[PDB]
Structure 1
Amino acid sequence: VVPTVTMLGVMKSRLVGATRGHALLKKKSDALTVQFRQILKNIVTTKESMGEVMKDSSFALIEAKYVAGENIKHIVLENVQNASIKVRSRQENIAGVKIPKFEYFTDGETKNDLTGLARGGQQVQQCRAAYVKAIELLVELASLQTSFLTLDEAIKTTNRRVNALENVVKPRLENTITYIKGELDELEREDFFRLKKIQGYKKREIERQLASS
């Protein structure tokens, strides 16, 4: 870019703004990383639900098999009284990230039931009780994925600003400072020095001419 005092001021302002924006983006990325760590911890904690509720559902299934032998299956698939599975979605916002929220049958709205099997009460209390845990796990996984993507984007932007933009601007500021002070200021003194030399030469010539008379 062309070096000038106004250009130097503009470059300094751009560097200051870049530093401020980098700090703000680092803060946002840190907050998003904290939220992602919390979501990962929650998912790890709720992973054990997928084992506990599964064991309970297995026990209920064994009890139902011992009660009525082979389930009807086929047309109605049997094995349950609840869980008319229908899923509804919601969008929450955390640190500017649109974290989805999930609700479904036996874990929210859109649920219905009718009759059931012999142990259908037990099956609902164990096999259909895992529905809430599954919905929570799905919501946690979706939130973790969204947070990971947002954190990756923010970290890429922050790293680019720290490495490329600021280190691009600062050499430009140094070159602009050098071009002005290193050349224009030096030339101004040299021009004036040569002018003073011309004046001194004129005075000396006048004095010598007067003395020769």
Structure 2
Amino acid sequence: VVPTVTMLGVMKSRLVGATRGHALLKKKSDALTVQFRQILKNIVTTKESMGEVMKDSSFALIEAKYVAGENIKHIVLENVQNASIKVRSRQENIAGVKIPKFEYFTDGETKNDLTGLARGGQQVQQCRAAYVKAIELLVELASLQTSFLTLDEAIKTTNRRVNALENVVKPRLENTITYIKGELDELEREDFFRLKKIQGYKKREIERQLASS
């Protein structure tokens, strides 16, 4: 840490860059937190729909038992008129972070139906609706987890910057300024004054010798 003005300028530039980076990181973290809050609200709505989804689904099973009695069981297993299990998900970059758009059955591609059973309509209205809810549930859960991890990392980086980087650089700048001034300027002026005194009393001695001679 040479007290030379080059190091002082370098440290000042580093502090300015640190401040700008801190501001940018704070803005990015705030935006990511807002997006995560919106995703959390959506996930809360989907969770509220959950449970009632299963309550609606149980009616389809009751209707199947009332109409067709026991299901086909084994590989067939009956009870399904729609919502073939086929999905389509893709990671999408939102707020600079890739978020998988987990679109599951009843909202995913290649979903298929085979007419309707005795309670196949009830199954479609109950079981397939649960799949549609679960598609959004999975997408929102993945997005929320990714956003939470990213926001935690960004907040950690910003807090680390504000607590260590500037809080160390500013003392470095202060120490550089103090050393530079109070050493170089003070000692240079002292040397110059001592030289001036040397010349002064040399002239005094010359005058004294001239008076003597």
TM superposition score category, shorter chain reference: over 0.9
- Mark the runs of 5 or more structure 1 residues left unpaired by the alignment: none
Secondary structure, counterpart of 2:102 in structure 1: strand
Deviations 1:61-108 (A, max 9, x none): 111111111111221122212222122211222211111112233213
Q: Once the 2 structures are TM-superposed, how far is the Cα of residue 112 of structure 1 from its aligned partner? A: 1.4
Q: Once the 2 structures are TM-superposed, how far is the Cα of residue 49 of structure 1 from its aligned partner? A: 1.4
Secondary structure, counterpart of 1:127 in structure 2: helix
Tell me if the contact between 1:15 and 1:169 (Cα under 8 Å) persists in the aligned partners. yes
Distance 1:104 1:158 in 2: 36
Deviations 1:86-137 (A, max 9, x none): 2221122221111111223321312112245311121111111111100001
Tell me if the contact between 1:73 and 1:79 (Cα under 8 Å) persists in the aligned partners. no
Count of matched residue positions in the alignment of Structure 1 and Structure 2: 213
> Hey, what does 2:138 align to over in structure 1?
138
1:97 aligns to 2:85 (yes or no): no
Tell me if the contact between 1:104 and 1:111 (Cα under 8 Å) persists in the aligned partners. no
Distance 1:98 1:85 in 2: 25
- Mark the runs of 5 or more structure 2 residues left unpaired by the alignment: none
Tell me if the contact between 2:103 and 2:138 (Cα under 8 Å) persists in the aligned partners. no
Q: Once the 2 structures are TM-superposed, how far is the Cα of residue 48 of structure 1 from its aligned partner? A: 1.8
Secondary structure, counterpart of 2:66 in structure 1: helix
Distance 1:74 1:195 in 2: 108
Tell me if the contact between 2:87 and 2:111 (Cα under 8 Å) persists in the aligned partners. no
Tell me if the contact between 1:103 and 1:135 (Cα under 8 Å) persists in the aligned partners. yes
Secondary structure, counterpart of 1:112 in structure 2: coil
Tell me if the contact between 1:4 and 1:180 (Cα under 8 Å) persists in the aligned partners. yes
Deviates more, 1:74-83 or 1:9-18: 74-83
Tell me if the contact between 1:67 and 1:118 (Cα under 8 Å) persists in the aligned partners. yes
Tell me if the contact between 1:105 and 1:111 (Cα under 8 Å) persists in the aligned partners. yes
Tell me if the contact between 1:107 and 1:132 (Cα under 8 Å) persists in the aligned partners. yes
Given the two structures, how large is their TM-score scaled by the length of structure 1? 0.95
Tell me if the contact between 1:43 and 1:141 (Cα under 8 Å) persists in the aligned partners. yes
Distance 2:14 2:113 in 1: 64
Runs of 4+ deviating beyond 6 Å: none
Distance 1:164 1:48 in 2: 43
Deviates more, 1:141-150 or 1:168-177: 168-177
1:62-81 matched pairs, under 5 angstroms:
62-81=62-81
1:181 aligns to 2:181 (yes or no): yes
Distance 1:131 1:207 in 2: 111
Deviates more, 1:52-61 or 1:165-174: 52-61
Secondary structure, counterpart of 2:108 in structure 1: coil
Tell me if the contact between 2:104 and 2:138 (Cα under 8 Å) persists in the aligned partners. no
Tell me if the contact between 2:106 and 2:135 (Cα under 8 Å) persists in the aligned partners. no
Superposition RMSD in Å: 1.3
Q: Once the 2 structures are TM-superposed, how far is the Cα of residue 2 of structure 1 from its aligned partner? A: 1.6
Tell me if the contact between 1:102 and 1:135 (Cα under 8 Å) persists in the aligned partners. yes
